Amino acid sequence: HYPTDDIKIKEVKELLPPIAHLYELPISKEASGLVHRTRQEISDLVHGRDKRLLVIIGPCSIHDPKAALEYAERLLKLRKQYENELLIVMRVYFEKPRTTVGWAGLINDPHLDGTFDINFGLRQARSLLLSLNNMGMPASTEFLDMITPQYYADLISWGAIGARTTESQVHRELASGLSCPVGFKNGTDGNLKIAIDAIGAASHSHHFLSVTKAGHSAIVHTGGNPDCHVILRGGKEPNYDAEHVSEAAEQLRAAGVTDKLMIDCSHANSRKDYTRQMEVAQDIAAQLEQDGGNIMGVMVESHLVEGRQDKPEVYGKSITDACIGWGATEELLALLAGANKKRMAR
Amino acid sequence: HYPTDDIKIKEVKELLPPIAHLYELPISKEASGLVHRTRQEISDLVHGRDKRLLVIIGPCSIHDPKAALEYAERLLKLRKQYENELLIVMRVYFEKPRTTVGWAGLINDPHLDGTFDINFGLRQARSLLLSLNNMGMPASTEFLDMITPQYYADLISWGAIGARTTESQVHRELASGLSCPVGFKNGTDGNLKIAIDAIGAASHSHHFLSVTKAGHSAIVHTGGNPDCHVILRGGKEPNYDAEHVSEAAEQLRAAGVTDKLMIDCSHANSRKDYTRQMEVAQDIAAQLEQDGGNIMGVMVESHLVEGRQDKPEVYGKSITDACIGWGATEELLALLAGANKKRMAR
Amino acid sequence: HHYPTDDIKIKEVKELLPPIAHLYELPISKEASGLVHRTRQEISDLVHGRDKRLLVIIGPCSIHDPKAALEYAERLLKLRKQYENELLIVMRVYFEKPRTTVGWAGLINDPHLDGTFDINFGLRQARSLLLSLNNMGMPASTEFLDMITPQYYADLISWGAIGARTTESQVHRELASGLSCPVGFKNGTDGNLKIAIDAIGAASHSHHFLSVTKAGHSAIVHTGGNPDCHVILRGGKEPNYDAEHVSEAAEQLRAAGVTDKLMIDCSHANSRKDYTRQMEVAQDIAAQLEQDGGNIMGVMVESHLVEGRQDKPEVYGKSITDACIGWGATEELLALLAGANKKRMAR
Amino acid sequence: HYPTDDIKIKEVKELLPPIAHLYELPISKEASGLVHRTRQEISDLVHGRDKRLLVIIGPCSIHDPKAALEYAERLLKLRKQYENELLIVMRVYFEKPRTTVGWAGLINDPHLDGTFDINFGLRQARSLLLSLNNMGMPASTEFLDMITPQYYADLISWGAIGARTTESQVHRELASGLSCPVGFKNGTDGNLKIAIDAIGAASHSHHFLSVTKAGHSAIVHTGGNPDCHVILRGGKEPNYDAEHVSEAAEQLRAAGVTDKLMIDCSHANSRKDYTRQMEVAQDIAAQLEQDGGNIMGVMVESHLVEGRQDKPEVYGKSITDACIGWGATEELLALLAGANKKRMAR
Numbered sequence A, B, D: 001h002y003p004t005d006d007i008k009i010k011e012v013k014e015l016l017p018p019i020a021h022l023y024e025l026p027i028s029k030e031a032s033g034l035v036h037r038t039r040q041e042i043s044d045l046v047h048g049r050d051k052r053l054l055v056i057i058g059p060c061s062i063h064d065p066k067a068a069l070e071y072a073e074r075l076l077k078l079r080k081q082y083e084n085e086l087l088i089v090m091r092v093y094f095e096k097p098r099t100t101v102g103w104a105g106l107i108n109d110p111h112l113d114g115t116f117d118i119n120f121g122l123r124q125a126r127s128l129l130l131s132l133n134n135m136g137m138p139a140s141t142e143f144l145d146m147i148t149p150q151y152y153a154d155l156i157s158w159g160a161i162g163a164r165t166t167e168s169q170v171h172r173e174l175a176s177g178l179s180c181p182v183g184f185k186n187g188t189d190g191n192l193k194i195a196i197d198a199i200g201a202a203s204h205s206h207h208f209l210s211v212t213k214a215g216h217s218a219i220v221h222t223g224g225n226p227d228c229h230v231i232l233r234g235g236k237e238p239n240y241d242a243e244h245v246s247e248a249a250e251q252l253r254a255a256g257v258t259d260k261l262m263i264d265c266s267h268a269n270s271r272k273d274y275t276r277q278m279e280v281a282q283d284i285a286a287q288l289e290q291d292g293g294n295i296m297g298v299m300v301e302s303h304l305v306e307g308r309q310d311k312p313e314v315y316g317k318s319i320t321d322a323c324i325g326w327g328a329t330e331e332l333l334a335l336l337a338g339a340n341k342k343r344m345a346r
Numbered sequence C: 001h002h003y004p005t006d007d008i009k010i011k012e013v014k015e016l017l018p019p020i021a022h023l024y025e026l027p028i029s030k031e032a033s034g035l036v037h038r039t040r041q042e043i044s045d046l047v048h049g050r051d052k053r054l055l056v057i058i059g060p061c062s063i064h065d066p067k068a069a070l071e072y073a074e075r076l077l078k079l080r081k082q083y084e085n086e087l088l089i090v091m092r093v094y095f096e097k098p099r100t101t102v103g104w105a106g107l108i109n110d111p112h113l114d115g116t117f118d119i120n121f122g123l124r125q126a127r128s129l130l131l132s133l134n135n136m137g138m139p140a141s142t143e144f145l146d147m148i149t150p151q152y153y154a155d156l157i158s159w160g161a162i163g164a165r166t167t168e169s170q171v172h173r174e175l176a177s178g179l180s181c182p183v184g185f186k187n188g189t190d191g192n193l194k195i196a197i198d199a200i201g202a203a204s205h206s207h208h209f210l211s212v213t214k215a216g217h218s219a220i221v222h223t224g225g226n227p228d229c230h231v232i233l234r235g236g237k238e239p240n241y242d243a244e245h246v247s248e249a250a251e252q253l254r255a256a257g258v259t260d261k262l263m264i265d266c267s268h269a270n271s272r273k274d275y276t277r278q279m280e281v282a283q284d285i286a287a288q289l290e291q292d293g294g295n296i297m298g299v300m301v302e303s304h305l306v307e308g309r310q311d312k313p314e315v316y317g318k319s320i321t322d323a324c325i326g327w328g329a330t331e332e333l334l335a336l337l338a339g340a341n342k343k344r345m346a347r
């Protein structure tokens, strides 16, 4: 009898089911209110019912809950100060996808040492998200697979599907059943069609495989997600300017989906240079002042301390993509608030 | 207390676990032998140790197990006839990914009527795959998600990751733990870099989330898959010709991965016209006759009857992509066997 | 230096297929469902004195061969019909007999009779037999020895037992309080009736106990109570089947405020462990029914195709646990009881 | 279709699996050492290698973890003081079995209000047991079913099977795979044969049904438990005296099993008068001074405050069987330590 099963598998270990984490860390009344309200506020921006600017802002990746919470406390002050112009939500992404081998993020490898203590990672991720919502700071994340959402999607006010997965049938099927609004990034080399197609597909009912809250293999039947939109993040060339926004809007209208979109100030739009995020933001600010009718949001990579480092040595500094520091964040947010204040006069 | 969980979910239904199907349909001694041997024979092609041509050939999708088994019976005679020149493996794909709403395939919706009887669909797919191996025909399939392989990957001799998922981090993590060799298709518009990158990534150990054979949420730690290769399937223009093969081989060598590749005669290489598959095969044959050192395999969409139909009215005729019929299949295989006989004799 | 403290004396823990895997392959039919539902109600009617037919739980000590069980049931079915106005005949379908010294663990635990313990196959085979019996028109009965097996096949059971060794057990009484079927509690090994009277009372109330869901996951079960429990007299140090003993049991049952209708086992300790004495017990019960017998609602008999017992399964239709009466004796015993109860019912 | 399934069931609710509790409350290195060594120490008493007296002492039932921990802190001082004569282990029983309807114990109904919050119950039981072991106090309990051991038996140094279940085949099968030594109580009316038979059965390998640590329906194959003994707890008349011990010992030797036994001072030996436990203990002390070679242990129902109460009003006072209070406990342990010192000196 020749072996055919699990030939290239080192180990398959049981995980605690979602319901174990939900039992220890139930969503509170106040967190559930914030999540509910923020999802609705964001849908209003997606569909042009309100003209505040969504701002998804925070670290490239979370590697230290302490720093994240300090960041959120500073950010909360500005979320409140600018609440008539901006809808500020913290970027709480646990991993950056990789081609070359490297750190698998705070959920998969919380101890930053290759031990892959995923039960601890998921618990810590849920704990941080609950703490954020409890302090008044809504959270956003990218969903990389079809199982992690069951552990903490209830605490997420906006979700992303990344460039590497926007075209994936199963990730679009996932998006169609996510409780939050969902942004789809354009493709790595700039392809907008995959994102426009994703919004259309995610609006419909689908089935996909995942687990129950009790941790058992399941088929999920979704209702469709009416609150999806594109995220422009460059690729071919940066696509943040008025010309590119106009062309994307045209193509969105041709497909019969929302022509309100988000612009990422970082990644391929900054050309991996954190010092250009302000320049992109300045360009968007000028669009918002002149007209900017198709913009509903921006994304910004921001941390306590600017730049990046290979090892987690400096407190509050990214170990993935380089981020603007806190002082520059204050400036960038003041810029956008002032420009959108003007746009809202119309 | 505001609701925040499963807001856009119609139903979450626990499935029978893999162990239930494996009890009803254990892999036989004969089927285990065939799978084990075929996986090794393919590894030998991927790594240039044998110069037979792998031929992945069969329906675009399986919608009728009766027709599939009939097809396999005919194909088996040619698998045997050409065993010194070609390694013939049946294409056994249960679904074609969609953008616009349509049939979800024989696993998800086996009754072709929107009932989504997935417990029946998984049973039936396993049964067909066991029957195929038991008759002496190895099987191949595309893995669209991270859970289905637990139900039947033990019966699969060669696996594919399609154009829409080659770039996906989690689908590369999956491939790194698949027991079979894996082909990665180039991107929808022709992007080969994603597939080259994929082979590299898939050769390493990774972690991803799935279920145990008992159906429980799990973390999977893989060993890496040394037997991955790219599949040329066209883009904006076809990419089957010697010039494209030569450049792909140089890029594969530049990345330090295998420079032996597979060419799809169908999909974008046929410009979506089943009558052009033979012309692609004729070009491949000329390449093999002249040199063709970088070719290890071909893919062909073939069925009992040529063409396609919207409803399953005609027996043995595709309801997804149009396929060549049985007579043409005999001719195309004869063509490839003859050309490769000459390549092998050098 | 973590010292080991978990599973120190465990050779292996293996996953079982969940109940729902067996239910998927072998769903209860519409016919079987009807028979189970009506037979349970018919038995309730006997327990509560609303009908004077005699329940007869009859068949092998233990099932070790499905073929012989189905042949047995075909023969018995003819008599179930013939005597339907006097007797309510249900086949005894017990897969195991409990042991103190090591021996065969029964057809569910060790279906292949060779210590391989292929329990997935054993449970499937048990469910298949029970479904086949109900489909042919023969209702089935069984003894429940643990709190998990009922999820696999209790839906096919018309009458359940809790044995002498478990009647006093808190958890087995909790189980009984949630079983869909009527339940008989055997008196204790040495004759103790009090534990069975107490069990009927306890089992009538709502309880909670641990088990598994149909999907096979650890679970707490909250029951509604079982109003259809009764005692089973099966002897002790002395047999307890005679009129004096039945009259005493009924006084104690009424004193406790629970049903004073009971079942009498013709086998085991009432037969003094001798299969050739079952008829004597049945003849004493016949005489009670003719004279009065108002407190008897049923009897239990160990019966097979072929009389006696054997130490290896060589003779087709012959017990490998307790010796049983053969088929010809089974015809005689049932004829005897039907005649006697016809007279009781006419009064 | 007539209904036949779960006719008389109000609800079936899935529990958190053992792995969830094990994650929150892993056994510590120190606790694992205490458990491991205490089990071996008790095995030594069972097999007559050591002549210390095992003392299983504590509340009839635990209804308040705070009182239990306070009790343990006081008892630990005496465990240490008398460690050369007595092996003191705390009685940590969560439930007393009932015939008439009443409180189902701290695991099944921790809130003492009929809410049956068993997930909270199991967590709290495990938490108390871990705390006890961590402070240096080993714990003992009675196992009433075949599932609860999966949640906390790793923390138990000695286990009991009670009078109502000693004869049960499945409870004997359970005992045959318990990691701790096990005492079997004589039957309600005094029957010793069921406990002698239980020791023999439990020494052998058995199979029984339960759940895996992940909570899945399982078959358990045991190795046999060589460390079982009887517990004399009275019958129609008490059975603690020299004459009864002598007779039980003769029957044990006749059966070929250990003739070292435990005597319960409470229950049907005190005839449910807590003030008689000291009288039983005095008789046992006299046996130990004179010969007492078959006695390996005693059991005593003891709490902070003597007596019992129907509602949990007074702190540290039983709501199940009446117990001796702390002062009487000090006296009883001093008495037994002195008497066994003389026994061991022979």
Ligand SMILES: N[C@@H](Cc1ccccc1)C(=O)O
Residues within 6 Å of the ligand: A146, A147, A149, A150, A153, A154, A177, A178, A179, A180, A210, A211, A220, B004, B005, B006, B007, B008, B009, B012
């Ligand atoms: N629980 C997710 C939806 C989901 C269900 C099941 C699997 C995966 C995702 C949400 O509320 O957004």
Ligand SMILES: N[C@@H](Cc1ccccc1)C(=O)O
Residues within 6 Å of the ligand: A004, A005, A006, A007, A009, A012, B146, B147, B149, B150, B153, B154, B177, B178, B179, B180, B210, B211, B220
């Ligand atoms: N069982 C798969 C590998 C796998 C394990 C677990 C989850 C998914 C896939 C194979 O043998 O190829």
Ligand SMILES: N[C@@H](Cc1ccccc1)C(=O)O
Residues within 6 Å of the ligand: C147, C148, C150, C151, C154, C155, C178, C179, C180, C181, C211, C212, C221, D004, D005, D006, D007, D009, D012
């Ligand atoms: N399913 C059983 C009741 C039961 C439920 C859960 C566990 C055990 C028993 C019946 O119908 O009789």
Ligand SMILES: N[C@@H](Cc1ccccc1)C(=O)O
Residues within 6 Å of the ligand: C005, C006, C007, C008, C010, C013, D146, D147, D149, D150, D153, D154, D177, D178, D179, D180, D210, D211, D220
């Ligand atoms: N885990 C138990 C043994 C056991 C295993 C499985 C089920 C029940 C009990 C122990 O270590 O004592």
Ligand SMILES: [Cl-]
Residues within 6 Å of the ligand: A211, A212, A213, A214, B012
């Ligand atoms: Cl669920």
Ligand SMILES: [Cl-]
Residues within 6 Å of the ligand: C168, C169, C170, C171, C173, D097, D098, D099, D164
């Ligand atoms: Cl009880």
Ligand SMILES: [Cl-]
Residues within 6 Å of the ligand: C212, C213, C214, C215, D012
């Ligand atoms: Cl259930």
Ligand SMILES: [Mn+2]
Residues within 6 Å of the ligand: A060, A061, A096, A267, A301, A320, A321
């Ligand atoms: Mn980034």
Ligand SMILES: [Mn+2]
Residues within 6 Å of the ligand: B060, B061, B096, B267, B301, B320, B321
């Ligand atoms: Mn196709």
Ligand SMILES: [Mn+2]
Residues within 6 Å of the ligand: C061, C062, C097, C268, C302, C321, C322
């Ligand atoms: Mn018997």
Ligand SMILES: [Mn+2]
Residues within 6 Å of the ligand: D060, D061, D096, D267, D301, D320, D321
């Ligand atoms: Mn007590």
